[PDB]
Amino acid sequence: VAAFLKNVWAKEPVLVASFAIAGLAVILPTLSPYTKYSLMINRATPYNYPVPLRDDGNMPDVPSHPQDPQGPSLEWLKRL
Amino acid sequence: MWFEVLPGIAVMGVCLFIPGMATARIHRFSNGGREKRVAHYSYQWYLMERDRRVSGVNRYYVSKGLENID
Amino acid sequence: YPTKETAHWKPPPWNDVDPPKSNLTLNFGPQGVLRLVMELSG
Amino acid sequence: MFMINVLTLIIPILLAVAFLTLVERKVLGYMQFRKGPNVVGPYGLLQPIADAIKLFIKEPLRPATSSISMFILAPILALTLALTMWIPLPMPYPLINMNLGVLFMLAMSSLAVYSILWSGWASNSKYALIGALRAVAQTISYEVTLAIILLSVLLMNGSFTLSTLIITQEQVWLIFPAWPLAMMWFISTLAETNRAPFDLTEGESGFNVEYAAGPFALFFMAEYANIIMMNIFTTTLFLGAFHNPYMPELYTINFTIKSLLLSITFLWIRASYPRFRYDQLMHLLWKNFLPLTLALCMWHVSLPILLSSIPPQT
Amino acid sequence: MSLVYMNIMMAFTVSLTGLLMYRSHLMSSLLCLEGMMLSLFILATLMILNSHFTLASMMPIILLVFAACEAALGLSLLVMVSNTYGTDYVQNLNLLQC
Amino acid sequence: SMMRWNRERRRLQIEDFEARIALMPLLQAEKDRRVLQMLRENLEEEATIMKDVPGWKVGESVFHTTRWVTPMMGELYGLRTGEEILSSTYGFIWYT
Amino acid sequence: PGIVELPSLEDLKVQEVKVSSSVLKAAAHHYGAQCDKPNKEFMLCRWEEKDPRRCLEEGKLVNQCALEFFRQIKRHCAEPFTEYWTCIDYSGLQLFRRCRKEQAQFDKCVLDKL
Amino acid sequence: MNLMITLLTNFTLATLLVTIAFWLPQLNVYSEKTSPDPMGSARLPFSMKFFLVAITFLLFDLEIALLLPLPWASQTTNLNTMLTMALLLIFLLAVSLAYEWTQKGLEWTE
Amino acid sequence: MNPIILIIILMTVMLGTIIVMISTHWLLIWIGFEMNMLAIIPIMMKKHNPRATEASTKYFLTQSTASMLLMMAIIINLMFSGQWTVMKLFNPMASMLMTMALAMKLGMAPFHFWVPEVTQGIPLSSGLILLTWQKLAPMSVLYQILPSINLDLILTLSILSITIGGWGGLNQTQLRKIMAYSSIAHMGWMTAVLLYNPTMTLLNLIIYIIMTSTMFTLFMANSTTTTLSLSHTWNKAPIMTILVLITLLSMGGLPPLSGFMPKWMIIQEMTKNDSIILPTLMAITALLNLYFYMRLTYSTALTMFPSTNNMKMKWQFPTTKRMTLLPTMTVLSTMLLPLTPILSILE
Amino acid sequence: PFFDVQKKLGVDLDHWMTIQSAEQPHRIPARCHAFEKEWIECAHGIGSIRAEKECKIEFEDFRECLLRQKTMKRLNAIKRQRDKLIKEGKYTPPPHHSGQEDLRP
Amino acid sequence: MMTYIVFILSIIFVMGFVGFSSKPSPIYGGLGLIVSGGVGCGIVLNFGGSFLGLMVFLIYLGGMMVVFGYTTAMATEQYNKVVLGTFITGLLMEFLMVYYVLKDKEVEIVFKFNGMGDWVIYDTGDSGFFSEEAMGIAALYSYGTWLVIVTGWSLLIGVVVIMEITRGN
């Protein structure tokens, strides 16, 4: 497993370099924990209007103004 | 002497420099002292047409500011 | 049921294999100077 | 006022390719210890004028044209594909701004081989047809590797618009985190223009041997226009200069400087290496360029997701 | 509907009447096949872009690619004839009748 | 460097999208009044153009439902000059 | 089928916000912060009714309060708004990132005066 | 329409150039060339490797067109499915290249 | 003929057919059809002879024309419906174009002109595949579109296919052309019944698939391609002569064999819908089918044709071929009559 | 036959592309989303025969939304009448249909 | 005249098909269908579909009919009446339908067809900050799992087919 690696490096450096880069690109998105940061970055982009919903009388998790503290803020992208 | 081919390089430079400056100057003159309003999406085009309708001239580059309202 | 129109239809070969029924030659011009007669296979 | 802009784009293109011929002549002269043209005028300034007027009064070669219409249509199509393709370059604003300008240039560069195919078809000599087929095969394969490299580059950019690529290259140049893609793109710009050390269009028979001197001049101007186009494209997309929105001529001067030194690098490389063989550069792509290019594409499509660096669409 | 729709139908019928009553070799048949390709592509793209069906933009591109590979298959078939009879004429395709 | 710059560009994109989101209800009201004005003008003109032919009811909607239906380009700009039709139905695509 | 019902021009005559694109774009954040409730009322009516003819008067309310925004801009801090919208209007792309100093100046002037 | 204006202007300038190169030297009265290549009389050989590499180019370009829309797709919500799909598609390109390597494709025209 | 490549190609054919079966979108139906024909092209180029290239060229041209017609029908249906569920079409032109597109795909007369040629020029395994597995998918497509099928067009195609197949099989002496015309006649027989009760169509399809598989398995086992070698086989194995005799007796719908099961019950669904002349006409053409079947059994087993001298060496070697599923498919094609109501599982 | 593997093992493969009124990215509406929604809610679970016999009005409205044939005929008749009335010259178009009316915004 | 531009191009599109309908020679037919592909892509581009039009340019014209010309260059060695007769027949049918749709503005061949210009079916709405067809294509990698699977499998199988059936042994 050691002499064969150096043999394929000396014979075909391009092929073993391509295989190593492909293996790194396979295993690194799962290993790196910043994929979820890209997930919440993509999911928080407001392509459409956040259309307001009708207040029946019982909804504590929704605000009545964009400046109110309750609701999902986006300060984590500001700090990073 | 190495400083003899540089007149050709300078002619190359002015030949490649004239069209970019020309189109920048034409863009600045045609759009009323402003850049050309690009339209990559339909919302920008709708705001373009809103400006053309609001301006009262059918030329958007004569923009109307705060003084147009009461 | 042989008729006049189909009277020339031979029986097919028993192995159902059709019988099969070269190389390039170049004349390089003299346009030192050399005239090459060149034989190629691609 | 638009047609004035069109004329001021298309006439300096012809002047620039004539001075490509002149500058390449004296640079290849000075690279090899001799001197270039300096007799006609001051430092050979009037040589391209003599070249043009000579090539515009000569007799044709009179070939036995199998198809007269195709023989007429091939240089018109070649000059059209070389000349109308310069539009979406952002210097600092394009003449026509497309959201898919890079795709536009890529599609017409992919279809540019029709001039070579029609030039091979117009000549009744079969060896010219063989050379045309070999050139077409080389060009279509090398367009494949160009397509993969450019796909990687604008997935790094994230948007197909060429004008936003200047904004992308503001802090650092794209050559710093894409240097291996830069080397493969440098071999591809060296190689896609039918240029030495991979110039099989001269060594053993050209693809336009029976064509007249006028169409030959048109083909050469078209090829040199493509050379300057893709040199400027490399300058813009790998070496993007600083662009002030109020002060544009510094960016124009800066990318003109990079374009001139990249063209000088082209003339440098063409004067230092012996010609390859057909199977040699076929082996260069089909066994050495393609797997490395695929691995680079895999890495660059996996990187921004793991780095939280997915670029904006808009 | 719109007139461009009927123009595309008439173009497809032109490609149909060109694909069937040929006199030349198989390249003419494959060219008329590509005419059918192009007519179907333009009609599908016009339909998807007119009715604002956003997802069915997967329809046109796919409608090429698959049959495009199939078209490549046809080219290989012609090469087989070019490796057997010298010319790819359809009048040489009279060996299976008997 | 490019991850930092891409994050800054994403923040600027979020800011511009927020600006468009806060801006658009005025545009919606203006467009609503515009299309209703155009439809009323077209309806009145259709009423006064042709009073002679039989078998015609003014404002006869071709849909069986009474629900509101989005107007067409031909339903709004179909009675104006050709230049306005060109700048409406082909202005965006032909804009450079 | 049935006759389509249309309100006349007498229900459509209002004052218009005769302003350019950059004029609206410069103060769009304070637009969304100050006149938010009539905008929310009007678009909830639009999204649930799915009919312009049942929401028109509500839009008129927006077309009043929006004017009440611009008057408050005009009487107090008109000059920083003028500088901000002309700096935004110079850019063809109307980028927010190229006029940060005028944005900060306008924000400070608004926060001290109003 | 400005794009088509540029295209028409460019095509007409090319037409003017080819008209100058084709009909302007016809004013001269030089000569008539009666004129009574290595190809003597043999038919053109069908070098199969060129056709094979051409259709290989065709298949690779087709699935390159499949591979294309990643820059637009990168803003999608489901990034994991996109990553799996893109990696598996480039792996399919690698597998097809490996097969074209193994079955004597890249020999005698390497 | 790499075994890995052959396995992958067969799995691709199976995947394409099952994609036609299990999908709910027209594009996936066309996807399965295209992948099926693309992966079935190398099956008919197994032996590498020019006749196979001729047959595959004709097959590819006909199938591609049918596929282009299939997109014409799909795009017209999209125009007039705006939706893509595989169900009844919403346009008479869509139904007409789809009907002759599937007729071109299935070799229904007068679009049958490729079927007796292509099957003549391909190896017997490829002929078995083309005449057995290829017919499965467009039967599913025609089953899922039966509310919008025009009655006149499918009836004209059915009667023309039955008559033309019988009259074309009445003359050929090659085994593969006889098999092709028999397949055409059976296709017409089981498409005549489709609009009234498709369970009879599925039953006739299964019976025809089993019986054609038995016939082709016997032909590959005896290594016989013409009438004369099939006559000569009686020196080698008389039990194979008995088997081909009884399954050719079953092939003409003579009771008490399995081939009398579908067609008779097809008549059982003709008089329910008040149609009397039609089953009589198709029964007469089935009698024509039985005539050339009887000619084949007269040549094969009921006589004793003169042989050659070399049979003696062939008497010193048993049959070494992989005679796979021959006894089960032979029994299921002869003695399945008292289990007729098993067709209830096909509902 | 029609084997329903997707309904058997509960995995979606092509149900999302099947109808125009289905869920699409960023909830972009089609031209006839409401008409198709009403037609499907009319013709759900009642059979194709009763759907084509009882919900004919909704399907006809959906077809008119897709094709726009009656609107074509109405607009063509109106335009032809305008051309005729400008031929005998009894009526002249108002300034608000010529481009000189000081448009609403 | 301008407002019917797509229709005008559509007429040219039909003309382009006639340009290879008679099929006198494969090379001229390929040239005529190249011109027809160009004008059909112009038809697509005038509807706002830039991405599909450049798909037509990049793949159909510049990447596949190039291969068609490459293959037809390997045959049809270099150097009709009923060809010209069919050309005039197609010309007469095309022009007759042109006068039909320019005078009656309505015709029946299979269905009812209108001759009025197509500028009445477009949309005055806005998609926002994105092209509709751009992210329509972009939704392939997020939703189209099975379609991408079968597309890659079919193209790999086509590579297998090319390697196998052209080996000759």
Residue A76 CB coordination number (10 Å): 11
- Whose CA is closest to K57, among D105, E32, D121? D105
* D308 close to A37: Cβ distance less than 8 angstroms: yes
Q: Tell me the C-alpha distance between I293 and I169, whole Å.
A: 9
Using CB atoms, which residue from A25, A26, A42 is nearest to H77? A42
Give the domain range for residue B32.
Answer: 1-70
* G39 close to G58: Cβ distance less than 8 angstroms: no
Give the CA distances from residue I140 to residues I17, I42, I105, in Å, rounded to whole numbers and listed in that order.
Answer: 10, 24, 13
Minimal Cα distance from H50: which residue of E? E79
* E54 close to J24: Cβ distance less than 8 angstroms: yes
CB contact under 8 A, C9 and E85: no
* G21 close to B55: Cβ distance less than 8 angstroms: no
* I263 close to I204: Cβ distance less than 8 angstroms: yes
Minimal Cα distance from A28: which residue of D? D306
Identify whether E93 is part of a domain. no
Q: Tell me the C-alpha distance between K158 and K15, whole Å.
A: 34
Identify the burial level of K87 via C-beta atoms within 10 angstroms of its C-beta, where 0-12 means exposed, 13-18 middle and 19 or more buried: middle
Give the domain range for residue K75.
Answer: 4-166
Q: Tell me the C-alpha distance between D95 and H5, whole Å.
A: 12
**Sign of the Cα pseudo-torsion (D39, D45, D48, D50, in order):** negative
Total of domains in chain G: 1
G37: Cβ–Cβ under 8 A, 6 or more apart, which residues?
A64, A65
DSSP code, position J29? -
* E91 close to C5: Cβ distance less than 8 angstroms: no
* I242 close to I233: Cβ distance less than 8 angstroms: no
CATH number at residue K98: 1.20.120.1200
For residue D197, is the peptide bond before it cis, meaning its omega torsion is within 30 degrees of 0? yes
In a 3-state reduction of DSSP, which class is residue D104? helix
User: Vertex I273, ends I268 and I278: CA angle to 5°?
Assistant: 70
Please give the single-letter amino acid code of residue I87: M
Longest dimension (CA), chain E: 55
Residues of chain J neighbouring G17 (CB-CB closer than 8 A): 105
For tokens 């089609």, name the residue. Answer: J30
* I119 close to I180: Cβ distance less than 8 angstroms: yes
CB contact under 8 A, I64 and E33: yes
Q: Tell me the C-alpha distance between D135 and F1, whole Å.
A: 41
* D189 close to D231: Cβ distance less than 8 angstroms: yes
Distance in Å from the first CA to the final CA of chain K: 60
* F36 close to G56: Cβ distance less than 8 angstroms: yes
D281: Cβ–Cβ under 8 A, 6 or more apart, which residues?
D138, D191, D198
Q: Tell me the C-alpha distance between D222 and H14, whole Å.
A: 11
Residues forming beta bridges with residue F60, ordered by sequence position: G3
Total of domains in chain E: 1
Minimal Cα distance from I18: which residue of J? J3
User: Vertex H59, ends H58 and H62: CA angle to 5°?
Assistant: 85
* B31 close to D69: Cβ distance less than 8 angstroms: no
Token duo for residue D263: 């063209």
CATH number at residue E54: 1.10.287.3510
Give the domain range for residue I168.
Answer: 1-347
Task: Please give the method by which this entry was determined.
Answer: cryo-EM
Strands C24-27 and C37-40: antiparallel
Q: Tell me the C-alpha distance between D150 and D185, whole Å.
A: 9
* Cα-trace Rg, chain C: 24
E76: Cβ–Cβ under 8 A, 6 or more apart, which residues?
H55, K161, K162, K165, K166
For residue F27, the distance in angstroms to the closest alpha carbon of chain D comes to: 21
Q: Is D215 on the interface with H (CB under 8 A)?
A: yes
Give the CA distances from residue H78 to residues D157, D266, H84, J29, K85, in Å, rounded to whole numbers and listed in that order.
Answer: 20, 44, 11, 21, 58
Minimal Cα distance from B49: which residue of K? K124
Total of domains in chain B: 1
- Whose CA is closest to G23, among I295, F95, J105? J105
Q: Tell me the C-alpha distance between I96 and I149, whole Å.
A: 8
Identify whether H36 is part of a domain. yes
Q: Tell me the C-alpha distance between D90 and D178, whole Å.
A: 21
Residues forming beta bridges with residue C24, ordered by sequence position: C40
Give the domain range for residue G50.
Answer: 1-114
C25 membership: H or E segment, kind and range: strand C24-27
Q: Tell me the C-alpha distance between D159 and K160, whole Å.
A: 35
Q: Tell me the C-alpha distance between H76 and J25, whole Å.
A: 9
Token duo for residue F30: 């203006």
Q: Tell me the C-alpha distance between E49 and E47, whole Å.
A: 6
* E72 close to E37: Cβ distance less than 8 angstroms: no
Token duo for residue E41: 């592509």
Residue H7 CB coordination number (10 Å): 14
- Whose CA is closest to H57, among K66, E95, K110, F21? K66
Identify whether E96 is part of a domain. no
D9 phi and psi, to 5 degrees?
-85, -40
Q: Tell me the C-alpha distance between F63 and F75, whole Å.
A: 14
- Whose CA is closest to D250, among A68, I160, H45, B20? B20
Residues of chain G neighbouring A67 (CB-CB closer than 8 A): 33
In a 3-state reduction of DSSP, which class is residue C26? strand
Q: Tell me the C-alpha distance between I266 and I204, whole Å.
A: 9
Residue I30 CB coordination number (10 Å): 21
* K21 close to K83: Cβ distance less than 8 angstroms: no
CB contact under 8 A, I41 and K161: yes
Q: Tell me the C-alpha distance between D63 and D78, whole Å.
A: 19
For every residue of chain F, DSSP letters joined together read -HHHHHHHHHHHHHHHHHHHHHHHHHHHHHHHHHHHHHHHHHHHHHHHH--SSSS--TTB-SSSS-S--PPPHHHHSTTS-HHHHHHHHSTTTT--
In a 3-state reduction of DSSP, which class is residue E21? coil
* F42 close to G59: Cβ distance less than 8 angstroms: no
A27: Cβ–Cβ under 8 A, 6 or more apart, which residues?
none
For every residue of G35-67, DSSP letters joined together read SHHHHHHHHHHHHHH--GGGTHHHHHHHHHHHH
* D287 close to H106: Cβ distance less than 8 angstroms: yes
CB contact under 8 A, B66 and G86: no
In SS3 terms, G60-97 reads as HHHHHHHHHHHHHHHHHCHHHHHHHHHHHHHCCCCCHH
Tell me the H-state helices in I23-146.
26-40, 50-81, 92-106, 115-118, 124-132, 136-143
In a 3-state reduction of DSSP, which class is residue H78? coil
Q: Tell me the C-alpha distance between D239 and D295, whole Å.
A: 23
Q: Tell me the C-alpha distance between D254 and E24, whole Å.
A: 58
In SS3 terms, A22-74 reads as HHHHHHHHHHCCCHHHHHHHHHCCCCCCCCCCCCCCCCCCCCCCCCCCCCCCC
Resolution in A: 3.9
User: Vertex I311, ends I308 and I314: CA angle to 5°?
Assistant: 160
CA atoms within 13 A on the CB side of G28: 25
Give the CA distances from residue G4 to residues B24, D62, F66, J38, in Å, rounded to whole numbers and listed in that order.
Answer: 52, 74, 7, 19
K48: left (phi over 0), alpha (psi -120 to 50) or beta: left
* D237 close to D188: Cβ distance less than 8 angstroms: no
* H54 close to D282: Cβ distance less than 8 angstroms: no
- Breaks in chain K (C to N over 2.5 Å), named by the residue before each, are 79
Give the CA distances from residue J7 to residues D200, J4, J14, K98, in Å, rounded to whole numbers and listed in that order.
Answer: 60, 5, 12, 50
Total of domains in chain K: 1
In a 3-state reduction of DSSP, which class is residue K1? coil
In a 3-state reduction of DSSP, which class is residue K106? strand
K86 phi and psi, to 5 degrees?
-65, -30
Q: Tell me the C-alpha distance between D157 and D101, whole Å.
A: 14
I128: left (phi over 0), alpha (psi -120 to 50) or beta: alpha
Please give the single-letter amino acid code of residue H89: L
Identify whether H47 is part of a domain. yes
Contact I/A (≥3 CB pairs under 8 Å):
no
* I263 close to I205: Cβ distance less than 8 angstroms: no
Give the CA distances from residue F46 to residues E52, F58, F84, G13, in Å, rounded to whole numbers and listed in that order.
Answer: 29, 7, 19, 21
CB contact under 8 A, K124 and F90: no
Q: Tell me the C-alpha distance between K40 and K53, whole Å.
A: 9
For residue J100, the distance in angstroms to the closest alpha carbon of chain K comes to: 21
CB contact under 8 A, D279 and H54: no
DSSP code, position D34? S
Q: Number of H helices and number of E strands within chain E?
A: 3, 0
Q: Tell me the C-alpha distance between F69 and J32, whole Å.
A: 9
**Sign of the Cα pseudo-torsion (I158, I160, I163, I168, in order):** negative
Q: Tell me the C-alpha distance between I32 and I51, whole Å.
A: 27
* D279 close to H49: Cβ distance less than 8 angstroms: no
- Whose CA is closest to D121, among D78, D76, D67? D67
C40 membership: H or E segment, kind and range: strand C37-40
Contact B/A (≥3 CB pairs under 8 Å):
no
Token duo for residue G11: 């229900």
Token duo for residue E62: 């796919």
Residue C18 CB coordination number (10 Å): 17
Number of residues written out for chain I: 347
Q: Tell me the C-alpha distance between B21 and H61, whole Å.
A: 38
Identify whether H110 is part of a domain. no
The CB-based long-range contact list for I58-62 (8 Å cut-off, 24+ gap) reads I58/E93, I58/E96, I58/I114, I58/I117, I58/I118, I59/I114, I59/I118, I59/I130, I60/E70, I60/E73, I60/E74, I60/E77, I61/E26, I61/E29, I61/E74, I62/I104, I62/I111, I62/I114
Q: Is J91 on the interface with E (CB under 8 A)?
A: no
Identify the burial level of D7 via C-beta atoms within 10 angstroms of its C-beta, where 0-12 means exposed, 13-18 middle and 19 or more buried: middle
Q: Tell me the C-alpha distance between D49 and D18, whole Å.
A: 8
Please give the single-letter amino acid code of residue B25: R
* H70 close to D301: Cβ distance less than 8 angstroms: yes
Q: Tell me the C-alpha distance between J39 and J61, whole Å.
A: 9
F37: Cβ–Cβ under 8 A, 6 or more apart, which residues?
G9, G12, J104
Q: Tell me the C-alpha distance between A28 and A47, whole Å.
A: 30
**Rounded to 5, what percent of chain B is helix, strand, coil?**
65, 0, 35
Q: Is B41 on the interface with K (CB under 8 A)?
A: yes
- Whose CA is closest to J71, among J81, J61, J82, J59? J61
Q: Tell me the C-alpha distance between I88 and J49, whole Å.
A: 11
CB contact under 8 A, K157 and I41: no
Total of domains in chain H: 1
H18: Cβ–Cβ under 8 A, 6 or more apart, which residues?
D72, D75, D76, D79, D214, D215, D218
* D64 close to D70: Cβ distance less than 8 angstroms: no
Longest dimension (CA), chain G: 61
* H75 close to E88: Cβ distance less than 8 angstroms: no
Residues forming beta bridges with residue C37, ordered by sequence position: C27
Residues of chain D neighbouring H84 (CB-CB closer than 8 A): none
K8: Cβ–Cβ under 8 A, 6 or more apart, which residues?
K1
Q: Tell me the C-alpha distance between I22 and J5, whole Å.
A: 6
